[PDB]
């Protein structure tokens, strides 16, 4: 909780039609993970609203 304003950042002339969106997010891998593209991955923890 708290209060703050949102600034304008950028404006783009993209006259497309929009209906859906997807969040793009990184998956971690290391010597600890199996590294398999389907299952050898670590997310850590993250949250969005």
């Amino acid at each position: 909780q708290g209060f703050s304003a949102l600034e304008p950042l950028v404006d783009l002339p993209i006259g497309i039609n929009i209906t859906r969106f997807q969040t793009l997010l990184a998956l971690h891998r290391s010597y600890l993970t199996p590294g398999d593209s389907s299952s050898g991955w670590t997310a850590g923890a993250a949250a969005y609203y």
Binding site: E7, P8, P13, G15
Partner: protein
């Protein structure tokens, strides 16, 4: 040359002209129009206003 329902992207260029002050003049700033006297001012805007 393409004309479309989408916005324009190629234009101009526009011509700028010399500034003048204290006289009563017609002014055309960035597509804003009016008449009056222009003078320097103390107040500061935000950088996007």
């Amino acid at each position: 040359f393409e004309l479309l329902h989408a916005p324009a992207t190629v234009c101009g260029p526009k011509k700028s002209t010399n500034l003048v002050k204290n006289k009563c003049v017609n002014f055309n700033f960035n597509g804003l129009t009016g008449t009056g006297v222009l003078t320097e001012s103390n107040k500061k805007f935000l950088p996007f206003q």
